[PDB]
């Protein structure tokens, strides 16, 4: 029996497993329960701390994936299946995972906490691309990841009600962070040095923990990759959240009293809720999600945009960034004329139709303003330019400009901000070439997946992965990604400097789509208000 | 005794002209031909009545008076502004036209160019040195005609619906002159079946309005619009705001001591011309540049609809048009109001002055509209660079008032049956007195079209003289054939798709695409939708 794999946390004793990496072994503790199972009468409720157990919990394998939709658009295609659940679905899914060096550190080691994305409707800490073993070995950190409830199970809200208060998926996240403060030292982690990082909706979650004071005392630094809490998709108002909750009840046969409605919802099998999620959205769209964080004055006392504009952020360091082609990948899920299997060279009619799906629920004037800004009026009908322009519409509106607004406001209000654009297209990427560097495909390099010898990454790509892990770990340890080489300067509201990340050395550039984002961040909001 | 070449009989009676020397030889000039009864006293604000026939010989031997108008005094003595000021006495007796013809007079019918001067509809005169027709006629053997038309309140004060001041009488002055050309130009050797209108700024807007007014449209065959268009935001006014401006002007001068229109105009008729001129600008609703108090009114008569509606719903098959602008249309207007601008310093403005200048350059729009403008003309990587802000504000005024109205006209006319040719004039004259940051200012291609560099008393470059000759041939080729090209780089027609135009400078012709297409898409396609919602 290996004493390195035995740990006592506050709930009781755990048994881990030793794993192999190309650089040596690490210790993993997978499937640690941090909450009571949110089942039966506990569905839709805030999580409760896991009650202590006797005996030894087997922490040698990943636990169940929270109930969620499973993408079936390209069945068997590696580009989509890499994001689908790789374990059984269950409502009993509130488990977290700890990777540490082997033997376990005996000095307080910086902690990285990963929050997966997936539009608040999907995701799992057990996916291959989130394997913490390489970061922990290469950079000598403790890495924690948790499962949190998605879809209606995590974000169905009847605001004002006690039976479905909303944001419980975020509270699952907060509870795991409290678990880390109380327990991570038992694994050799330093609770006074916790860096949150997440991608997409995970980045938005990180941003929301930055703006919720009860969360702010649980971590020290933040990394937001391709997501932001001020995204048009990341939050929903109380009125619309109530409408969506009520509509889903009607769709699954529950008439239409909040108490009656949640009680009837709790009798439905989880899969039934999943099957009807999607039909509560008001219009055809891409990059919008049914059940997302609700601004009800509690977890978020105001909208993230209002909280960002009014916040003092001195003493905060954040790392934020984007991939080169944020929108390209969302277009195959609803923009007319698009497909992974052809060049998606669309007509102007399809482009104009794509703008309404990509910018849903706005006035015709707002839509025409988008068309004006993203049309080259010397080549208004060129299919290649139109495909690229629609990809830029979706990417700028949902990712690049929300991230750029966040970066600019925090920098100008006291935070030290580092910005990147990930510009390397993996040699193993199965998506077509016209998609460029699609959303989500920097994660595998951050986690050091290319070091896995059973994968087909090149030698320079492995070096690149090691470069990225060092930047991320430098930031986690000091608030500065630079090795203490061409220096990575902080992002500021004036100079707007960022670096491009690829196989070539660092190149400093100015402006995160400055011209496009002035439209989304400065003008379009005022058009909608008047 | 008498030179038979300088004696002509038109319908009103006999005329005596003058023989002018040019660098290339003799030209016959008939200057100051009366074409209307003097619009004075009881005829103030009325449409022009045709000139009654006369006995004996009228001496048409010098330029007649300039129509009463404001005289610019911003830079007194500065030639850059004095060249546009009246060079004859001011008078309400000013409805005279000028005819230049080859010496000897042509024996076969000769194409006719008719010039309409600009000046924001408040100023201008056919007698300005820069409009001297002797060089075009000598170089290209055409007949050139120019007329005076009433400006300011005298030409465009409108109490719509009233008979005592119907408005647009300045445009009727132009129309009467065009009717005179049809009835009389053959007596000078001109061909009334080949008349080409050309004009600049408000003259270009005037030319476009004659295109859109059926009674005028039968009086000419081709059109040249230089740095102006009838659909410009400054070129027309609605009936209500025209009535408000007329009523306020009357109130400012003492009329009435105004319900009844007859009575109010009668009181206006007793006021000295200069007093009307002195108060004319006080009726503008706001502090602005490129906006003019009294301008053509859309009242259903001369223009049955707005020029933009008539342009869109018009069939222009069989019509040839030549349109263009200078490289820096807006820079010249900024020293007349924009904060921080002057011809005597570099006018490197701050961001606050840029934002203040936008409201002056784009007057009377919602704050939302103003901020759409700020968004499109800000470089968000260099939001406060003074030199970039100076150029941005110049582009705002130039795009909004000239380039984009011209581009919209060129595009709609091309797509609806007209053959269009477009240019951008990019030569900065060696004799230019305005500062270097202004580039090629508004109005400073005219002297090259009229061949002014060929005057030996002026110190133009020898290369600029060749340039002038090249431009006069383009214009005259268009007047003769509807095509500026010679019967050598080809000047392609402008179309709504390819949007090709040529650059005019000392270099050979260069074909380019798009008359500030991205900018004009904002002014021509989006901004009107915002002003509606
Ligand atoms: C690119 O593909 C889209 C999607 O069509 C599907 O995928 C193709 C690869 C092929 O397998 C098709 O048979 C599939 O239907 C095309 O858009 C569709 O076009 C068809 C007409 O053939 C039409 O009936 C569908 O409604 C269209 N659907 C969408 C979402 O646009 C598109 O035309 C292709 N572009 C090309 C070939 O240039
Ligand atoms: C550039 O000049 C403008 C115009 O001012 C006039 O011309 C100058 C050369 C100088 O002789 C001034 O005294 C003239 O009045 C300047 O803008 C003016 O500034 C003064 C005082 O600062 C102010 O009272 C006026 O209202 C301003 N006029 C306008 C139209 O804004 C400007 O400051 C000069 N810029 C420099 C010198 O950098
Ligand atoms: N619960 C659902 O029914 C459901 C279905 C589909 N989607 C989204 O489609 C899957 N998807 C998967 C991967 C990338 C994008 C997308 C679409 N985004 O709008 C969300 C929820
Ligand atoms: N009738 C008048 O009093 C009057 C006063 C001022 N202006 C304008 O003169 C300024 N100005 C003079 C020359 C060229 C442009 C400009 C400005 N245009 O906005 C016209 C008429
Ligand atoms: C034409 C009109 O209605 N306006 C009146 C007119 O009838 C009247 O003759 C005149 C007397 O001065 O005053 C004015
Ligand atoms: C330049 O022009 C002026 C007037 O246009 C003239 O008096 C002068 O002789 C010319 N030449 C020189 C060298 O100044
Ligand atoms: C949908 C996922 C992949 O992107 P984010 C919005 O979470
Ligand atoms: C003021 C004059 C030069 O401009 P145009 C509009 O006539």
Q: Is residue B263 in contact with ligand 5, taking CB distance under 6 Å?
A: yes
- Tell me how far the alpha carbon of residue B268 lies from the centroid of ligand 5, in angstroms: 15
**Chain B residues whose beta carbon lies within 8 Å of the beta carbon of residue A377:** 514, 517-518, 520-521
How far does residue B454's CA lie from ligand 7's centre (Å)?
A: 71
Label the pairing between strands B143-147 and B237-238: unpaired
**B382 to chain A, minimum CA–CA distance in Å?**
8
Question: What's phi and psi for B326, nearest 5 deg?
Answer: -90, 170
Atom of ligand 7 minimally distant from the CA of A202: 7
Phi-psi region at B481: left, alpha or beta (left = phi > 0; alpha = psi -120 to 50): alpha
Residue by residue, DSSP assigns A158-205 as -TT-SS--S-HHHHHHHHHHHHHHHHGGGGTEEEEEEEEEEETHHHHH
In this complex, do A514 and B372 lie within 8 Å of one another by their Cβ atoms? no
Answer yes or no: are the C-beta atoms of B177 and B203 closer than 8 Å: no
Check A365 against B529: CB less than 8 A apart: yes
Cβ partners under 8 Å of residue B82, min gap 6: none
Closest CB to A365: pick one of B375, B522, B530: B530
What strands lie across the sheet with B222-226, from one edge to the other?
A: B18-22, B25-34, B96-102, B143-147, B110-116, B190-200, B222-226, B320-326, B419-425, B500-504, B510-513
**What is the residue-wise DSSP string for A281-324?**
SSS--SS--SS--EESSSSSSS-HHHHHHT---TT-EEEEEEET
Q: How far is CA A500 from the centre of its chain?
A: 21
Nearest to B518 among A377, A510, A519 (CB): A377
Count of A–B CB contacts within 8 Å?
Answer: 46
Distance (Å) from the C-alpha of residue B522 to the closest C-alpha of chain A? 7
CA of B459 to the centre of ligand 6 (A): 6
B458 pocket-lining for ligand 6 (C-beta < 6 Å): yes
Task: Please write down the HEC assignment for all residues of B31-80.
Answer: EEEECECCCCHHHCCCCCCECCCCCCEEECECCCCEECCCCCCCCCCCHH
- B263 phi and psi, to 5 degrees? -65, -40
Whole-angstrom distance, CA of residue A45 vs CA of residue A393 = 37
Mutating to test ligand 3, I would choose from A278, A339, A360, A398 the residue with most ligand atoms within 8 A of its C-beta, which is A278
Residues flagged as binding site of A for huperzine A: 83, 130, 329
Candidates B521, B522, B523, partner chain A, best to mutate (most A CBs within 10 A): B521
Query: How many angstroms separate the CA of residue B375 from the nearest CA in chain A?
Result: 7
Residues A112 and A109: their CA atoms lie apart, in Å, by 10
Of B371, B378, B520, the CB nearest to A526: B371
- Give the closest residue to B160 by CA, choosing from B58, B265, B56: B265
Is A343 an annotated catalytic residue?
A: no
Q: Relative to the CA of B443, which ligand 8 atom is closest?
A: 3
DSSP string, A25-68: EEEEEEEEE-B----GGGTTSPP-BPPP-SSEEE-BS--PEES-
Experimental method: X-ray
Closest CA to A286 of A351, A360, A348: A360
CA A313 to chain centroid, in Å, comes to 22
Of A375, A378, A515, nearest to B380 by CB-CB distance is: A515
The response to whether residue A388 sits with its C-beta less than 6 Å from ligand 3 reads: no
CA of B445 to the centre of ligand 8 (A): 13
**Cα separation, A241 vs A290, whole angstroms:** 9
Active site residues of B: 201, 329, 442
Q: Please state, in angstroms and as integers, the Cα–Cα distance from residue A526 to each residue in A235, B311, B525, following that order.
A: 19, 33, 19
> CB atoms < 10 A from the CB of A185, how many?
17
Q: What are phi and psi of A363, to 5 degrees?
A: -65, 160
Ligand 7 pocket test, candidate residues A199, A288, A398, A443, most atoms within 8 A of CB:
A199
- Pairing type for strands B7-10 and B13-16 reads antiparallel
**d(Cα B359, Cα B339) in Å, to the nearest integer?**
11
Distance from CA of A509 to the nearest CA of B (A): 11
Any ligand 3 atom below 6 A from CB of A69: yes
Q: Which atom of ligand 1 is nearest to the CA of A339?
A: 2
Contact B381 A510 (CB under 8 A): yes
Please name the residue of chain A whose CA is at the shortest distance from the CA of residue B377. Answer: A515
Residue of chain A minimizing CA distance to B512: A378
SS3 A110: strand
> What is the distance between the alpha carbons of residues B164 and B167, in angstroms, rounded to a whole number?
9
CA distance B514 to chain A (A): 7
Atom of ligand 5 nearest to the CA of B262: 14
For ligand 7, whether the C-beta of A395 sits within 6 Å is: no
Q: Is B326 helix (H, G, I), strand (E, B) or coil?
A: strand
Q: How many CB atoms lie within 10 A of CB B270?
A: 11
CB distance A369–B526 less than 8 Å?
A: yes
Break chain A down into helix, strand, coil percent, rounded to 5.
40, 20, 45
| A201 ligand 7 Cβ < 6 A | yes
Mutate to test the interface with B, among A407, A518, A528 (most CBs of B within 10 A): A518
Does residue A439 carry a catalytic annotation? yes
- Choosing from A139, A277, A305, A326, the catalytic residue is A326
Question: What pairs with residue B503 in β-bridges?
Answer: B424, B510
The residues lining ligand 1, judged by C-beta closer than 6 Å to any ligand atom, are A 336-337, 339, 341-342, 344-345
Contact call for residues A335 and A352 (beta carbons, < 8 A): no
How far apart, in whole angstroms, are the C-alpha atoms of residue A218 and residue A223? Answer: 15
What is the four-CA torsion angle of B176, B178, B183, B186, rounded to 10 degrees?
A: 150
Contact between B328 and B394 under an 8 Å Cβ cutoff? The reply is yes
Instruction: Report d(CA A363, CA B530) in Å as an integer.
Output: 12
Instruction: With CA atoms as reference, report the closest residue to A509 among A322, A277, A282, A285.
Output: A322
């Amino acid at each position: 029996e290996d004493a390195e794999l035995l740990v006592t946390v506050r709930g009781g004793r755990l048994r881990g497993i030793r794993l192999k990496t190309p650089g040596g072994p690490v210790s993993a503790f997978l499937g640690i329960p941090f909450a009571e199972p949110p089942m039966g009468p506990r569905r839709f409720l805030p999580p409760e701390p896991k009650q202590p157990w006797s005996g030894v919990v087997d922490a040698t394998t990943f636990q169940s994936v929270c109930y969620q939709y499973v993408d079936t658009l390209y069945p068997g295609f590696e580009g989509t299946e890499m994001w689908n659940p790789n374990r059984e679905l269950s409502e009993d899914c509130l488990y977290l995972n700890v990777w540490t060096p082997y033997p376990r550190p005996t000095s307080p080691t910086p902690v990285l906490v990963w929050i997966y994305g997936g539009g608040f409707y999907s995701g799992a800490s057990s996916l291959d691309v989130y394997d913490g073993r390489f970061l922990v070995q290469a950079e000598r950190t403790v890495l924690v990841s948790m499962n949190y409830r998605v879809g209606a199970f995590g974000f169905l809200a009847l605001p004002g009600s006690r039976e479905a208060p909303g944001n419980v998926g975020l509270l699952d996240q907060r509870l795991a962070l409290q678990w880390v403060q109380e327990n991570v030292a038992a694994f050799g982690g330093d609770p006074t040095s916790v860096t949150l990082f997440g991608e997409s909706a995970g980045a938005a979650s990180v941003g929301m923990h930055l703006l919720s004071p009860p969360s702010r005392g649980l971590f020290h630094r933040a990394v937001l990759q391709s997501g932001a809490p001020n995204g048009p998709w990341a939050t929903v108002g109380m009125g619309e959240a109530r409408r969506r909750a009520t509509q889903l009840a009607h769709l699954v046969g529950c008439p239409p009293n909040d108490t009656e409605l949640v009680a009837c919802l709790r009798t439905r099998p989880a899969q039934v809720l999943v099957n009807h999620e999607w039909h509560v959205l008001p219009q055809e769209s891409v990059f919008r999600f049914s059940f997302v964080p609700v601004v009800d004055g509690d977890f978020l006392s105001d909208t993230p945009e209002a909280l960002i504009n009014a916040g003092d952020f001195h003493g905060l360091q954040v790392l934020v960034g984007v991939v080169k082609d944020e929108g390209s990948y969302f277009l195959v899920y609803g923009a007319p004329g698009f497909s992974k299997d052809n060049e998606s060279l669309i007509s102007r009619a399809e482009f104009l139709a794509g703008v309404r799906v990509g910018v849903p629920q706005v006035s015709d004037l707002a839509a025409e303003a988008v068309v004006l800004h993203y049309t080259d009026w010397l080549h208004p009908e060129d299919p290649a330019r139109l495909r690229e322009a629609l990809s830029d519409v979706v990417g700028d509106h949902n990712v690049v400009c929300p991230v750029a607004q966040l970066a600019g406001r925090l920098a100008a209000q006291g935070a030290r901000v580092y910005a990147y654009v990930f510009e390397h297209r993996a040699s193993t990427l199965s998506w077509p070439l016209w998609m460029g560097v699609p959303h989500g495909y920097e994660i595998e390099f951050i986690f050091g997946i290319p070091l896995d010898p059973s994968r087909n990454y090149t030698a320079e790509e492995k070096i690149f992965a090691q470069r990225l892990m060092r930047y991320w770990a430098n930031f986690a340890r000091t608030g500065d990604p630079n090795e203490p080489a061409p220096q990575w300067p902080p992002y500021t509201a004036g100079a707007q400097q960022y670096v491009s990340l690829d196989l070539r050395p660092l190149e400093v550039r100015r402006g995160l789509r400055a011209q496009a984002c002035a439209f989304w961040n400065r003008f379009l909001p005022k058009l909608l208000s008047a």
